[PDB]
Structure prediction request, 127 residues.
Amino acid sequence: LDPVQKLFVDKIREYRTKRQTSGGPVDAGPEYQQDLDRELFKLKQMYGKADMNTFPNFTFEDPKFE
Amino acid sequence: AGLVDDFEKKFNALKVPIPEDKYTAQVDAEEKEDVKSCAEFLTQSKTRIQEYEKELEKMRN
Prediction:
């Protein structure tokens, strides 16, 4: 609506509804989710697969003085 | 922001070593190879260069 901020309201209460759903704003739904699932997985492909919610730890060694 | 905090107290604690020795036996080989290059060959060389240089004082005759 064009007391223009009412079009922000027009949007905004549907943000209010959506964010005042769950996930914050959802209704994006499973189709979004398969899309996510690929790129979120695909990310891991570039990027390695382990402690993306914990700390990775590492190791230190030598072959020989060739 | 709470996956992050794991990786702080982990990374701040988790410290890396420098690699170790496995071949400083080259320094014992170097002390033995200096006993050879210096003392053993040096004193043996000082009597052999003298064997010629004492014959050079004999060649003055």
User: Anything to note?
Assistant: Chain A has one domain: 1-48. The helical segments of chain A are 5-19, 29-47. Chain A touches chain B at residues 51-58, 60-62, 64-65 (CB under 8 Å). The domain at 1-48 of chain A is CATH 6.10.280.200 (Methane Monooxygenase Hydroxylase; Chain G, domain 1).
